[PDB]
Write a protein that binds this ligand. Sequence first.
Ligand SMILES: Nc1nc2c(ncn2[C@@H]2O[C@H](COP(=O)(O)OP(=O)(O)OP(=O)(O)O)[C@@H](O)[C@H]2O)c(=O)[nH]1
Lengths: 122, 61, 49, 50, 176, 388
Amino acid sequence: SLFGKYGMFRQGMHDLKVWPNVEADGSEPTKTPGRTSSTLSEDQMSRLAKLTKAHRQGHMVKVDWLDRLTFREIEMINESEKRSSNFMYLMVEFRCVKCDDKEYGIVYYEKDGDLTSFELVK
Amino acid sequence: RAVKKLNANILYLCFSQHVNLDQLQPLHTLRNLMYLVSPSSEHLGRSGPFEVRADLEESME
Amino acid sequence: QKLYSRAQRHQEKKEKIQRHNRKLGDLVEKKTIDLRSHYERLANLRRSH
Amino acid sequence: VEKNRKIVAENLEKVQAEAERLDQEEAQYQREYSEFKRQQLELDDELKSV
Amino acid sequence: MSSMNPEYDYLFKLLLIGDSGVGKSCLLLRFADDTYTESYISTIGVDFKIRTIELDGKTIKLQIWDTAGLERFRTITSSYYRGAHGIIVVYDVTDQESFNNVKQWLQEIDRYASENVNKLLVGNKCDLTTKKVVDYTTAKEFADSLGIPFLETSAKNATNVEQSFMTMAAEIKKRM
Amino acid sequence: ENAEWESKPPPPGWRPKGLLVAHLHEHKSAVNRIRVSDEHSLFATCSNDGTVKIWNSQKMEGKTTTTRSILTYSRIGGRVKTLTFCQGSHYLAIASDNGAVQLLGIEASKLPKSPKIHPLQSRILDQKEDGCVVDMHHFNSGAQSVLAYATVNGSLVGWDLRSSSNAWTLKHDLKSGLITSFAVDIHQCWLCIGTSSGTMACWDMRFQLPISSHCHPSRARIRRLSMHPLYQSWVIAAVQGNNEVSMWDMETGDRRFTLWASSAPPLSELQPSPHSVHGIYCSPADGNPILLTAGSDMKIRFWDLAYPERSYVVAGSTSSPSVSYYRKIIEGTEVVQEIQNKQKDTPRRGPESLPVGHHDIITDVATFQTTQGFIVTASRDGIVKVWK
Ligand SMILES: Nc1nc2c(ncn2[C@@H]2O[C@H](COP(=O)(O)OP(=O)(O)OP(=O)(O)O)[C@@H](O)[C@H]2O)c(=O)[nH]1
């Protein structure tokens, strides 16, 4: 989806799960969804991938000693998952908008987005 | 202070021996002791938990 | 084969652990009875004193 | 080659199905043992108290 | 005056970055642990080996972070560069794509790293002379055009690797 | 940056003299836990008798004639094993051996009305699927106030008391033993689970993944776990036997500091001493962390990790011979060993002074501070004593 769960346009790098042997489906809801929402079975790889990225951007607390061990654990999980889930992941990156060095987010809004009882009009 | 401490000690002993709370008076020193060391005190000598009655705690305050 | 041998050891461990708990439960009950007697003795000795 | 591969795969699947069943039973044993272990730890503390 | 420690007169945060499968992990293993293997586990997140060295009689504790080379573990922002004292950009001499992207990494370093960060291009997989496709002059013109230190190394045929970490430490010491 | 291990650090130079201040024997069975409120105005104790009792810590200062439980909750049923106060002293969590966990609100009703406790939220764990609660701690991430509790089936669940949803769920490997205790980092980044088989498993809470699993060489049961107040990667685990309290750095797995208060040869893996540490309290003090430990040896011992020579017994049997503590390095672990000095009429006013110590295993230790710092200790015979 081009707009997120809160109407914000996607930003940064996003890894989309590629469904093998099927054309990309545009119906709503898509039969070949790239971003598996949290409502379905939480793929430990998908949850950890989001966490690794959240860490890279500096959105997670850095604990040097924990990181060496935790990231090493993530490496083992990702290595194990890559061996059993042979699914390919295609990376897509969306452009970012900057003005005066500030990043702006595009939010879905309609151009026209900005009396029930009458005494005489029946 | 000494009399208060003694009365507190007697009351504490009465509680430890499960003395009948209806016979205990917070200001009666020897009367409480007489009921405690009374041959009729059925719980005198028990080893177990005991509760200090809020009414007896409040009566000392 | 290794899983079967582990499974056999676990079956032994379950019965073994069950027995250890049963022995302790009876021993605790017995020591509780002896303790009850001890408290009665203490109470009687105290009452006499 | 295909027939032999199919036979070997079938045997591997049968042996793996038994392995998964044993693993579930082993997990159940750990659960029950945990309950007995809690009791054992409780009794040891109780016995020392008595 | 300030508090200091005898275990290291200086602590240099190094940082290995570069596309996937270039050799970032093996450089770290070959330097820190004199270790090598053909078995590839794709680095995720961060790794943090240590080697303590003496240079010019002064003692430098290198702290030599790996980084993810897969894209799916990578983000436009990257806090890993923050506070880095040195940055090592790695390419695989058998992987032209991994060579071309070196400019993209220098774009990353210049955006996030410390303003004085000592870069160092390291041509890993330099044991692959049978498959070398980025050659010394080809890189040296680029590296010299930036003035970044340069070397070619193999963590397989170790010896080049040692000089790569010694070079980084030297260029750091010259700044420190 | 604002790392606070305790809402009220002990006064400087606090050395508990072991003077009994209040003797509370309201519980009918073994007391399982002691907790102090965040405001330090109240503390609570739970017992096998099925009751949870909340006490006003300010009332235990001796200024009141009779100190009894301020509130008595008994609706949880079964044996109440553990309890913990939640930030702001407004919530009390309780667990029973039946598998029932209920959060009761302690309403600080204005005097003279006694506070009323009413069950606010309740959770009933399936005795077949989840089992009973083994240990429980509460940590507030600011947005979610999560109570983390561990079950017999190895499920560690953090119930966010704000949204009633599970903030996080961890599944411990039962092969590592039954969960016996856990500690959560002050920085809330990670938590460590101790087991009955002596395994100490480290869990990263930021990623919610188990990172490392290490087992004690003796495989002895872990009684209490606490994060180290000074070392961010160290966890202090009191292990069954020899009254051993060992601090382990979970990054490398090496035992860095160990206390050996047993008659067995120090660090001896053979035939341990039947005394064990039950309660562990770690305070940074102000750079010299102090640990007070009490256990089946009925002694409350203050071990000073900075000056082990100054460690001493706070409360114990009156006839206890003088003990000296010496620091020695054995097998790479800094071990402070308690050595009993062989003790080689004075007129007594009245009968021989009665022993103020506990007569049964001290099951837990906690501290509260009012005008002075106090240590509260409860024993398996149901007696809770508050010492200054
Ligand atoms: N022939 C040769 N192969 C190497 C050399 N260094 C690394 N490799 C190979 O490349 C693999 C990956 O090395 P890494 O350090 O992980 O490369 P990387 O950039 O870190 O890859 P990621 O960790 O996924 O980012 C190794 O397992 C080796 O197979 C080298 O010096 N010579």
